[PDB]
Design a binder for this molecule. Sequence first.
Ligand code: MG
Ligand code: MG
Ligand code: MG
Ligand code: MG
Ligand code: MG
Ligand code: MG
Ligand code: MG
Ligand code: MG
Ligand code: MG
Ligand code: MG
Ligand code: MG
Ligand code: MG
Ligand code: MG
Ligand code: MG
Ligand code: MG
Ligand code: MG
Ligand code: MG
Ligand code: MG
Ligand code: MG
Ligand code: MG
Ligand code: MG
Ligand code: MG
Ligand code: MG
Ligand code: MG
Ligand code: MG
Ligand code: MG
Ligand code: MG
Ligand code: MG
Ligand code: MG
Ligand code: MG
Ligand code: MG
Ligand code: MG
Ligand code: MG
Ligand code: MG
Ligand code: MG
Ligand code: MG
Ligand code: MG
Ligand code: MG
Ligand code: MG
Lengths: 124, 210, 124, 53, 53, 147
Amino acid sequence: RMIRKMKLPGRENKTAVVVGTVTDDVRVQEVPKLKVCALRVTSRARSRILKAGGKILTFDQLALDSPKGRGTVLLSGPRKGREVYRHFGKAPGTPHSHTKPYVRSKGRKFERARGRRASRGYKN
Amino acid sequence: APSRNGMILKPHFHKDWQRRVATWFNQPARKIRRRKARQARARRIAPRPAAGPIRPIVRCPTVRYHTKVRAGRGFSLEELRVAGIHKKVARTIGISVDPRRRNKSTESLQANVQRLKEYRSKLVLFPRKPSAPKKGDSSAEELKLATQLTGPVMPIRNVFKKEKARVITEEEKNFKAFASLRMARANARLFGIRAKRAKEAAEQDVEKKK
Amino acid sequence: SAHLQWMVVRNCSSFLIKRNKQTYSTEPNNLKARNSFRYNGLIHRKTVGVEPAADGKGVVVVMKRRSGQRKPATSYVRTTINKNARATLSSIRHMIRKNKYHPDLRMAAIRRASAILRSQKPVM
Amino acid sequence: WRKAASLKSNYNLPMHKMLNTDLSRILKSPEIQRALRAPRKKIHRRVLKKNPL
Amino acid sequence: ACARPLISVYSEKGESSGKNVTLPAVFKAPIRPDIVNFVHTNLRKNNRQPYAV
Amino acid sequence: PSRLRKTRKLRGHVSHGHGRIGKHRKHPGGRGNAGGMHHHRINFDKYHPGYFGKVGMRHYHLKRNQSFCPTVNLDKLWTLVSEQTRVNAAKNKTGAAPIIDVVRSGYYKVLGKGKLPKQPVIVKAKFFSRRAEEKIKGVGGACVLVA
RNA sequence: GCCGUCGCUGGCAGUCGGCAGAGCGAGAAAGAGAGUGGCGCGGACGCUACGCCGCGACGAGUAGGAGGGCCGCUGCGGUG
RNA sequence: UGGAAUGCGAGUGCCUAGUGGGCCACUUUUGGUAAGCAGAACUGGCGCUGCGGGAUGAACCGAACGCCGGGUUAAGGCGCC
RNA sequence: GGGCCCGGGGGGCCACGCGUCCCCCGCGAGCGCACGGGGUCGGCGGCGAUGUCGGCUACCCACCCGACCCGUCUUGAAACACGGACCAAGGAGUCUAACACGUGCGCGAGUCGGGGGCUACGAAAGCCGCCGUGGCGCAAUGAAGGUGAAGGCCGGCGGCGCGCCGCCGGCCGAGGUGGGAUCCCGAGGCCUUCCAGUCCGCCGAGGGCGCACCACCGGCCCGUCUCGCCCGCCGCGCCGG
RNA sequence: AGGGCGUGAAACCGUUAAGAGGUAAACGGGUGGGGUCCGCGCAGUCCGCCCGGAGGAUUCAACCCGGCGGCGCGGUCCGGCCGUGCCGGCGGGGCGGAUCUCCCGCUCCCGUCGGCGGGGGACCGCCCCCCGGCCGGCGACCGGCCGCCGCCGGGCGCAUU
RNA sequence: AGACCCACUCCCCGGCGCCGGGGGGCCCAAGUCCUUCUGAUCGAGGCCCAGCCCGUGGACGGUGUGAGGCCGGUAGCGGCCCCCGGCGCGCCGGGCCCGGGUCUUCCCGGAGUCGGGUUGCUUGGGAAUGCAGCCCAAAGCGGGUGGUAAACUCCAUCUAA
Ligand SMILES: [Mg+2]
Ligand SMILES: [Mg+2]
Ligand SMILES: [Mg+2]
Ligand SMILES: [Mg+2]
Ligand SMILES: [Mg+2]
Ligand SMILES: [Mg+2]
Ligand SMILES: [Mg+2]
Ligand SMILES: [Mg+2]
Ligand SMILES: [Mg+2]
Ligand SMILES: [Mg+2]
Ligand SMILES: [Mg+2]
Ligand SMILES: [Mg+2]
Ligand SMILES: [Mg+2]
Ligand SMILES: [Mg+2]
Ligand SMILES: [Mg+2]
Ligand SMILES: [Mg+2]
Ligand SMILES: [Mg+2]
Ligand SMILES: [Mg+2]
Ligand SMILES: [Mg+2]
Ligand SMILES: [Mg+2]
Ligand SMILES: [Mg+2]
Ligand SMILES: [Mg+2]
Ligand SMILES: [Mg+2]
Ligand SMILES: [Mg+2]
Ligand SMILES: [Mg+2]
Ligand SMILES: [Mg+2]
Ligand SMILES: [Mg+2]
Ligand SMILES: [Mg+2]
Ligand SMILES: [Mg+2]
Ligand SMILES: [Mg+2]
Ligand SMILES: [Mg+2]
Ligand SMILES: [Mg+2]
Ligand SMILES: [Mg+2]
Ligand SMILES: [Mg+2]
Ligand SMILES: [Mg+2]
Ligand SMILES: [Mg+2]
Ligand SMILES: [Mg+2]
Ligand SMILES: [Mg+2]
Ligand SMILES: [Mg+2]
């Protein structure tokens, strides 16, 4: 995601600033050179970025490089990525509420009988 | 009463469970008891392997695990007969023997024969009478350089054959795998009824003759 | 670094003393004895101390040399000034200003080297 | 941080969330000092309101 | 930081011997008192013995 | 830590955080999941829909290892081999194609989700998906089966 | 007048000192910028930044909630 | 020319206690001879709320509360208490 | 009355320069006074060592106003509602399992040795990776058998009758619209005698790439339905796609 | 501490002292009266500068010697040390690799001939250690001479300091 | 079991007798050193340049507060002495007269039990998981199991009473 957000036209030779961590993404094969500044960079993303030839700054190094933050690209990972945000919204068992319920296990006989079958009772 | 949103959780605490509570405060006091009796045993059997008799190489059942290899219970009497070791004398040189094992394949029977050869060759035997050597007995030069082997004897390690990079032929690129799976699955789900429908095609079209 | 080990010493030191809504500090070379980043006598690279001379009269001045920093034995230099009340308060002043040595501590050093002279006169 | 632990199985010293921890030298550095507005260090306490009448 | 000095082994007579050892990299790892405390106040709950009426 | 809990600020208030009008009685709704069909129906229908009834066929002696089949997607297929196997086929010129054995890594089925890098492969696997096999032909490569 | 809460997501690392020049309250987006040609050795306080300082507005409360306690009780690891 | 006026920073997300006996008043209002009765509507109160007045007072009139000095009021008052 | 009370011939002006072109006919120094960014006096006087000075609080007493006994259930309690003679000590949201959310920490598509093993405090701590079995996460969907997550343009061939269908070999490649912190370009400009004149900075009309997120529309996987036309071959089929 | 005897609270009681007393007592706000002790009250703060007034030192500045410390764009002085630096090499070495390939176990077919159980060897990456090059740091990590400055000690100063 | 072959003398117990863990008993360092507090010190200060002495002993308890050095103890692959047992080697009197491989001929199994019906209990075991009562009551290329009752036919798997 930092690749495709730094490949957008125009923002070349800029430093990708993050406030969280820069995890690896094993399902990407080519890595360009990137100037990056984050709080953490996992020990398998330091490898890829440095073998590519990019720099990995810190927030103090960034504050010395560009105090006013000129030449940067603020980013932030997906916030609704957490599995928590799938139970939020309209409660389940409600017309057009694709919200995930809290169930011990998922299977044939765990909340599949009445409020889901048009046969047994109804469905929403 | 249930709250707004949560699980329907069933706690299995409707029996007098406080009576039958098992606490593990003696877990460190039994790890030392086991380790102590494990070195009293590794001192009672002085040069014999500390882990005990050698165990065979054994595939596992249950397609979940039928690609790993394991250490069985004993060497089947077939593998002992092939290796030439009497089933009642094997147990006295630290070879494990269980009679219950069969041997349907051969690639494993020869693996366990090669295993017995690799053990009956590393075996340092001490003479029954100390002050007098015997015929089938390692010479006195070994016995002084005979130590107690720690850990399992001839440990079993899952290996994988390294296959080098080939070049793909036009018979390999021609192979539609998914169609072959859906076809073999159909030709197996339908084999019985096809054979019966053809027994009927052959039981009717004969009546026309007589 | 100074700000780093100050963020470790600011509350869980052994010289820190907290009672009666006040918070002083008992560091060796802390002058004004109060718990602060500026006056702490152990955190910085260059500190100043003004102790009383071991005998009756005089004031010792304890500068912390730059070269020896992880060598506590050969780190501090000490100079006993057993002079009148004014020359010693022009020698501490020169020691700090003309050397440009931690210059925000000068009036604190004079104010302490005067408390010592005052606490060494014959009582009444 | 470049040579792993030999006696442990796979362990490298934890990385640093900031390298130059001396924010005194950082703050009075020409890189940052130039990119600042002049300090507004004047105290403007409440002006008593007299009566224009 | 990155500069690892050269500590000097001290003979048993107090005087410094000739031997030197380069400061191991562990002595530059981050000082995290919160992690140290959280680990201490949990690891020393382990040497505790049960007690109950 | 009791000294951090909420019963240390609740000393001196009569009802201890639980109500003056409606007391904190023992079980004013029944125990457990009681009244799933009678007086807790709005909750068992607003939050656990489908909790009551039967559906489907039973299977008496189910053994969870006859149906063992862990899958791996094409996107992370190239992560099973080392890195000097994917780049050695880049620098390669004799067209040789590395053999990726999947059941050796611990997956049986190969599903095709991600993109692939343009180089040939020989994927040995137990089960293949239609698209997982088409994305491999379309890049040039063979889908070996292994029983 | 004083205490407190809230807001200003306010101000202060500029204690930049004979390697000196002491400013950012003023109605009007932006430099007390560079270069290129026509004696007396002196100067309060501060800054536990989880700190300090300035401005306004506000201040009832059962059931209930939250925070802050350098309020208190008994033992444990450190430290005085 | 941000297409009436006036005012004011808004939007959104989780987790959530207590409650699910109410009562009074102006006005409208149903049953009843009526009731400090039973029952509705709107707003404001009491409950959860002191203070000045109504001698007294859950609910009326004024007015809502950090601790204090000066000044002025509300509603009520000014023979004496 | 308004127009600087348009124009001609005794009192008040926050008006008082010379040199033109022209329509209307950038630094003067001092010196004080003060209705001026919240109080000072560079004004005083009395008493003070065995009977007097100060001490708001705290002990007793006096007087004026106020003032019903607390906990409780209650629409409502000082109640002719209940508990309470007095004092001391003890006395009530605890621990375990599960779940959910929030939060701090380590690692991060991985993660965790909890079980096992190896080496006074120590029953601790350390270590194992060919001890990661296994749990949870990385894939869902169907009752199941089971299936299981972008495509487009290009030629060349066969078919229908210029498009499409299938068929081989190319290159392009993981949607879009609206809002969107942040960042980027910059017409013009930021004074000191006067113009050109470069570097450094900063502001800025307008124009851009657009984080997260939100709305909407497309796309993809499984189940199901409807309408269909084609392709596959060891088994040509109540087959498979 | 006097045989249920460490400390010996509260309610309750006795006696002594002080005050008080017809709207039960107690209570909040406000003062006044009296007591109890405290301030160890009762001639009332000190501090810097300067001016004068009387005295006493073995005393100031400035020089000389020795030590110590700071700073040094000593534009760029000598020699070190490190770099979560960067390139080179008729270099040595260790870890890892799902990158490749002479001897050996044992195997099928007559010591010939093919499969595989095992260490070399080649290779790639990292790391470590010697080689040269620069780069840049020594402010988490310096040593000598040189310069300026400060300070201390010892002299020299005879006193309008 | 017969024949062909090869291989081949410790194995066990009982003592007699001597050879290197457990219990019990006893003991093993060093200040009561000077001044000074107290009712009493185990307190306070001192003990040079052997930094008072010991320390593999600074756990603890007692002793007129508070003790490494007063006492018992603590540490020690420290010692000394008793008893038990093990592990050992000889010797006696006994045992035991012994094995494997290839052919050939032979032999081989557990009943009122399994099993079916039915009833009662139990189990997650659902057209009966297990157990038990009553009735019926076996077979021997048979029997049981193969988690849906039944027939047919295949295979897998053990060998109940
Ligand atoms: Mg509730
Ligand atoms: Mg409350
Ligand atoms: Mg209650
Ligand atoms: Mg509550
Ligand atoms: Mg309730
Ligand atoms: Mg409850
Ligand atoms: Mg009902
Ligand atoms: Mg309030
Ligand atoms: Mg109720
Ligand atoms: Mg009513
Ligand atoms: Mg109520
Ligand atoms: Mg209210
Ligand atoms: Mg009210
Ligand atoms: Mg009245
Ligand atoms: Mg008033
Ligand atoms: Mg009146
Ligand atoms: Mg009254
Ligand atoms: Mg009650
Ligand atoms: Mg009532
Ligand atoms: Mg009454
Ligand atoms: Mg009652
Ligand atoms: Mg009573
Ligand atoms: Mg109590
Ligand atoms: Mg909840
Ligand atoms: Mg969490
Ligand atoms: Mg006593
Ligand atoms: Mg006693
Ligand atoms: Mg007593
Ligand atoms: Mg009396
Ligand atoms: Mg004692
Ligand atoms: Mg002593
Ligand atoms: Mg003792
Ligand atoms: Mg002693
Ligand atoms: Mg002794
Ligand atoms: Mg002893
Ligand atoms: Mg001992
Ligand atoms: Mg029963
Ligand atoms: Mg039951
Ligand atoms: Mg069958």
